[PDB]
Every structure is written in structure tokens, then in C-alpha cells.
Design a protein around this ligand. Structure first.
Ligand SMILES: C[C@]12CC[C@@H]3c4ccc(O)cc4CC[C@H]3[C@@H]1CC[C@@H]2O
Ligand SMILES: C[C@]12CC[C@@H]3c4ccc(O)cc4CC[C@H]3[C@@H]1CC[C@@H]2O
Ligand SMILES: [Ca+2]
Ligand SMILES: [Ca+2]
Lengths: 175, 175
């Protein structure tokens, strides 16, 4: 079962989850995505939308990560185009001080020395938003148009042990 | 004709070129590299080894860029392993405010918003060192052992119009 990553004209995420970082052990997430859209947000995460935030999206068909925290601030593209209408496996892992991006079983990007441990963030509540940002797109380091006309399936985010809340799936729309 | 990227035990580059940035028009370089070595420096560049420097190397077989300037400071891995004993084409381009890395005809990395124009650097003299750094390896954001047991060929760096000086090829060693 797959869900649409955008619902209608709005830019809002289709879903938000929140996690207690004092209870994280697994610091990775995995999902499959399918789209013909070259630009948009796949997911956004933060502990503070002003001071500690992360965005995985597509620009010109390829993955783009933007992140802004006390240790690093960056806008980076990598990997193959994904806007070919095929399902693609994506894994985004925090390992040590690094963020790893794997696409279709291949590591395509490693941002080294970019974060302290999730355990120790100043604010111990992490949000993950699917298909949109939790601030205006103009707040990005490099704006894009967030709407991603795509589908998401087989998605797991950190683990249930850490999860405090998840948005109502009443609004989710099947693909 | 190919040359070795390391000569004996020392860490020093095998060659240094310097350029007048007031005369650059082409801001890209291209070469082929072949190695079985998973770690080392391919080339280093700077306008100031303290304040504005760039390194392309291999770590765990894959490209790594480190760069430190007024606008960005980063350590990033991307692309496939290159330590498979095959010749690989590499192109490193500055385009707008971005650095592009292309391997075997595929863009594998785009560092966006990382530099002002080469035209306008505070110091208008750029050095490019092949096979080594122009400071101690401990000065890197993330140290590696610089010696790269590999070969380089078909290399062009910016253009001759901009070049002020090039090291004596008396020390270069053929592969
Ligand atoms: C933990 C994840 C990778 C690392 C991400 C990160 C990494 C650094 C940072 O300062 C904030 C965030 C928030 C979102 C995190 C992501 C949410 C899911 C993904 O697996
Ligand atoms: C111009 C090159 C790409 C951009 C590199 C860069 C990029 C940003 C910066 O602040 C310094 C340097 C120095 C070395 C430059 C490289 C030397 C050859 C390569 O093509
Ligand atoms: Ca879009
Ligand atoms: Ca080596």
C-alpha cells in the first residue's frame, strides 16, 4: 500500500511524526519512492525549525539534502535521477557524526562531521514531516517548490519505541 | 603518457601549478586516474592554505571533497569506488556558486552555495598541487594519509591563459 506525497494545491506535509530522542537507538529510516516530478520535498526533520533542521528532496530529478544545525549548514545534490517512474529504495542513516544516503542499495552520499548525536540534541523532540516542510519554503537555504507529485511505500522511520505521536491518517490518500 | 601520483615515501605533491585568477575564464579541470589504493590525495587547491583551500581525494575507495573557505566548510564523500584498477574520467567544475564532481561521465556530487566567484577571491593566486597537500595532513578537517599509489593522465587544469608557473617535471615519474 502506497500513499501520495502531495494532496492537492497546498504545500503542507501529508503526515508528521514526533519522536523522543532520549529513547532512540536506531538512527536510520528507509522507504521507497516513485515519481515523474523533478522537484519537491520527500521529507523534512527537525528538533528546532530555526536552529536544527534537515530536508531530503529532489531538484532536477536528483536527491538534494539541505541541513542547518550548530555544526554544519549545507546544500548538496548527489545520486542518480529518481524521476523516471520506477520505484527506488532510499535509506537515510545517521552514523557517528555523519549522514549517509543510500539509493537502490548504493551509498551515493556521505556528509561527514555534520551532527552531534541525536541523543544529545538541545531539544529532545524530533519531528519528521512527509512530503513537505514545517516552515515556509523561503526559509530553506536554497528554495525549491515543495510539492512532490509522487508515491511513498514500505516506509519505516527510526523505530516505534521512540515515537511519541503520528498525524491522523484520515488525510492520507492512496496511490 | 601517465605519471605516478606519489614518488617514494614522502607526502609531498608530485607537481604544483599556480594561476592568475584575474585571467581565469574556464573554471573546470579534467583528468583520468587509475589506482588500487583506497585512500589518498588526488589534488589540492588553494588561494590561502589557512582560509581558502580544497581537496579532492579518496577515502574507502570513493571520492571525498574537503573544502574550507569563508562561505562553506565541509567534508563530503560521494560517487562509486574508484580503486578497482580501471581508468576513470574525473571532472571538477566550479559553476556559479557550486562545485560539480563528474565521474565517468556522471555527475555524482554538487556542492551548492559553497564559493564566491574565483574571479573575486581575496588573494588572486590559486595553487593546484597534484598527489599531495600544501599543508600538513593534520590540518585537514578530517585527516587522511595523503599518499595515493595511482597514476594520472589526460589531465588539464583550468587553462594555459591563466597559468603563471608549473613545477619542474624533472621529478615526475612515468607509469
Ligand atoms: C534520522 C534521519 C537522518 C538524520 C536527520 C538529521 C540530521 C542532522 C540534524 O541536525 C537533524 C536531523 C533531523 C532529521 C534526521 C533524519 C530523520 C529520519 C532520518 O533517518
Ligand atoms: C577550479 C577547481 C574546482 C574548484 C576548487 C575550489 C573551490 C572553492 C574554493 O574556495 C577553492 C577552490 C580551489 C581549487 C579549485 C579547483 C582547482 C581545479 C578545479 O577545477
Ligand atoms: Ca514538484
Ligand atoms: Ca594511500
Amino acid at each position: 500500500p502506497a500513499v501520495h506525497l502531495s494532496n492537492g494545491p497546498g504545500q503542507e506535509p501529508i503526515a508528521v511524526m514526533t519522536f523522543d530522542l532520549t529513547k532512540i537507538t536506531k538512527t536510520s529510516s528507509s522507504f521507497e519512492v516513485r515519481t515523474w516530478d523533478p522537484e519537491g520535498v520527500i521529507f523534512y526533520g527537525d528538533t528546532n525549525p530555526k536552529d536544527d533542521w534537515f530536508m531530503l528532496g529532489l531538484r532536477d530529478g536528483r536527491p538534494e539534502i539541505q541541513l542547518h544545525n550548530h555544526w554544519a549548514q549545507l546544500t548538496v545534490g548527489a545520486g542518480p535521477r529518481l524521476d523516471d517512474g520506477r520505484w527506488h529504495q532510499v535509506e537515510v542513516k545517521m552514523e557517528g557524526d555523519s549522514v549517509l544516503l543510500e539509493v537502490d542499495g548504493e551509498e551515493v552520499l556521505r556528509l561527514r562531521q555534520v551532527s552531534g548525536p541525536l541523543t544529545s540534541k538541545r531539544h529532545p523532540i524530533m519531528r519528521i514531516a512527509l512530503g513537505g516542510l514545517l516552515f515556509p519554503a523561503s526559509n530553506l537555504r536554497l528554495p525549491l517548490v515543495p510539492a512532490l507529485d509522487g508515491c511513498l511505500r514500505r516506509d519505516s522511520w527510526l523505530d516505534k519505541q521512540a515515537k511519541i505521536s503520528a498525524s491522523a491518517p484520515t488525510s492520507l490518500r492512496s496511490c
